[PDB]
Amino acid sequence: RIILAGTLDSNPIDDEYGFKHEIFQTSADKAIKWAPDWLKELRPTLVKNSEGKIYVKTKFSQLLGRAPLMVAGMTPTTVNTDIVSASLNAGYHIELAGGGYFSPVMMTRAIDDIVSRIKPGYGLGINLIYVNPFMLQWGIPLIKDLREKGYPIQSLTIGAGVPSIEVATEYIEDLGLTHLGLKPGSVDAIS
Amino acid sequence: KIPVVEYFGGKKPASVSATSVNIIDGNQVVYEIDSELPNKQEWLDLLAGTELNWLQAFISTDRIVQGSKHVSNPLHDILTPAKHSKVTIDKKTKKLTAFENIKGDLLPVVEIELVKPNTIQLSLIEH
Amino acid sequence: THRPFQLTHGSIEHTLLVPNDLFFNYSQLKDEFIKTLPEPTEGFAGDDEPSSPAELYGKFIGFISNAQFPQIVELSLKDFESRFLDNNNDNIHSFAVKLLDDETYPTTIAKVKENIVKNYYKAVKSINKVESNLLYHCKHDAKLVAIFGGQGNTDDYFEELRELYTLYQGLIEDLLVSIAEKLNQLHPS
Amino acid sequence: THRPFQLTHGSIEHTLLVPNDLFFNYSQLKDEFIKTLPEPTEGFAGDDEPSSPAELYGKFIG
């Protein structure tokens, strides 16, 4: 943490570097502002479960309860239920692509087959395209209905764009998902 | 040297030191709730504990598997904090027992125990 | 036998208990205050216009620092520490940034500096040893290191020296005088 | 070393002498007061709105 002892001013908006006040700060709690060390805070470590299986401890691996390797949603490749079910059964997160589906009936049939073929308790991710309004319009209601019906739709991924804040919060709060995947293409989408 | 845990996933187990829990040690550690209630998430985390075990899984995880469906965990709603409620958790067997007031007497209403090495029995008692 | 003594600048109003005997000194110093104070304006946007009771009392301390009443300046500084620094749990700089963050009394960094820090360090004659939070954590977990810059950082670097002189005359006067004497000795070469 | 500590609600105003050491406690309690106090109204007709300095100081005590 850098503290500018040469100048006194209110701390920056992001609270990235301190000012002269931080050197002389006194308080009953005796708290001070720290900075994160990416290495020690994010070492990829290993954890062994009771059954002896070994996983790469990581934030993503913790969130998925599985290895930190995923298969991204592919419109020709991951559309098919066979590869999605096989990847889930092997124990790696994978996204069923909605590019090769065009109706809620077809998508629900595919999800039904995947659910029937995967092991119990294994979630499913879904990939949708932001540039395509039709797929989202019939898919988001489908995901919401399947979730309130109890399907193992673990997550939804938005590719080819990032939704705005107001659409995003609706996705987070209404769909009842474990995590929302997004695919930025530039620093603006990262923002 | 690899760390060994019962299960790997979900939210990391949390150490919660809150009010309205009244933790007392013994063969079964007892958490008792006064008139004012604690936070729901803090209470559930406290019951789960810092050790990754079957009870930590059965409380902490926000979903259960019914056939091939992911359903919300009813243990959250069951173990939601209640006025003048007690909860005894065994240290060794990790058996949980929730007591509530019925007709002026404290009686158990929820037992969670490990009947078999990989089977968890949740018994709701009606008096 | 204290008495209520009040200083106001528009909506600004700070009242303090002062000795009855020294109330006359306080009154005359207040009059000289409101003579030197710019006229009140809505919003207190004036550069020398205080925007908080803390700023007003700090300016009172800064004024009285140069007078025939060192006991006035001492007791005024004590009252400021008791009310505002809250019996010295937070340093004057921490108080300054807290005011700059406070929305009830909006002010500027320059206003806060001139009206609090300059006056506080003009009136304070002795500074007691204090262990900051940073120095406390230094002993256990924090690793403190120092970096001194060079040239090219700014094209008006002397302004920082003028600001330091204006804010902390009583703290660096001896160092500046010694260095200036050495420079006077050396530069004729 | 007492100090003047004032509580106000519209035209209501009560000032009391208080120890300087505990003045900080009084100030924070006053801030919480005027947070819980409704917006002042003409006539002080609000049901829980004090109508006298005695009412205000009693509410402070409460």
From Swiss-Prot, chain A:
Disulfide bonds: none
Function according to Swiss-Prot or TrEMBL: Fatty acid synthetase catalyzes the formation of long-chain fatty acids from acetyl-CoA, malonyl-CoA and NADPH. The beta subunit contains domains for: [acyl-carrier-protein] acetyltransferase and malonyltransferase, S-acyl fatty acid synthase thioesterase, enoyl-[acyl-carrier-protein] reductase, and 3-hydroxypalmitoyl-[acyl-carrier-protein] dehydratase.
Quaternary context: [Alpha(6)beta(6)] hexamers of two multifunctional subunits (alpha and beta).
Domain of life per record: Eukaryota
Residues of the full protein shown: 511 to 701 of 2037
Protein name (Swiss-Prot/TrEMBL): Fatty acid synthase subunit beta
Family the entry assigns: Belongs to the fungal fatty acid synthetase subunit beta family.
Taxonomic lineage from the root: Eukaryota, Fungi, Dikarya, Ascomycota, Saccharomycotina
